[PDB]
RNA sequence: UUUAGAAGGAGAAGUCAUUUAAUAAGGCCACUGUUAAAAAGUGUACCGCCGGAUAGGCGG
């Protein structure tokens, strides 16, 4: 479903704006390839948000003070300011760095469509 | 109690061949360097005698 939304139809837009739309033209070109369209476009603008059920060795968990208690932060990325810092970086004059690291099979297996889009993403170098 | 904790980046190799940088030219004019200092620091040692004496002591 990440790929099927990234497509670009006729006008150029993307299949995510023609559905928000029910857009006649996308509602043709589906109708003729299959009559669970209306299900598909339901359950694609229906999709749960993630939420956050558990934690694993992997994800990184700092303790932070409070009061002399220490809390527990669980440590998550964010791939939305990773591809909008990513995009507004590549226009830029700011001295900046490219991670370069990330396979494709790599940033596949992360799940994200941003991330696979944007597997070696620009950065701020943030240096003396 | 720190985006915590972990990590072998690695092997090998012909860069070569050739070449007009030339032509020309006013750097000139003017100018107050200036007053005042102990070279000190005994620079330095000498010649014998006792002692197997390299050790360690002596008179002048």
Redesign the pocket.
Same mark, same amino acid.
Do not use: A, E, H, M
């Given at each position: 479903p990440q790929g099927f939304v990234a497509m670009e139809m006729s006008d150029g837009r993307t299949v995510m704006e023609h559905l928000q739309e029910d857009s006649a033209e996308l509602r043709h070109e589906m109708e003729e390839l299959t009559d669970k369209y209306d299900e598909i476009r339901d359950g694609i603008l229906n999709m749960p948000s993630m939420q956050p059920y558990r934690t694993? &060795? @992997? #994800?990184? &968990?700092? @303790? @932070? +003070?409070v009061g002399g208690s220490?809390h527990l932060l669980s #440590?998550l +990325?964010?791939t939305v300011l990773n591809y909008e810092v990513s995009d507004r970086l590549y226009r830029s004059k700011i001295p900046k760095i490219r991670l370069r690291l990330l396979s494709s099979n790599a940033a596949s297996t992360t799940g994200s469509r941003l991330v696979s889009k944007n597997k070696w993403p620009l950065v701020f170098q943030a240096l003396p």
């Open positions: 694993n &060795q @992997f #994800i990184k &968990q700092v @303790f @932070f +003070p220490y #440590i +990325p964010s």
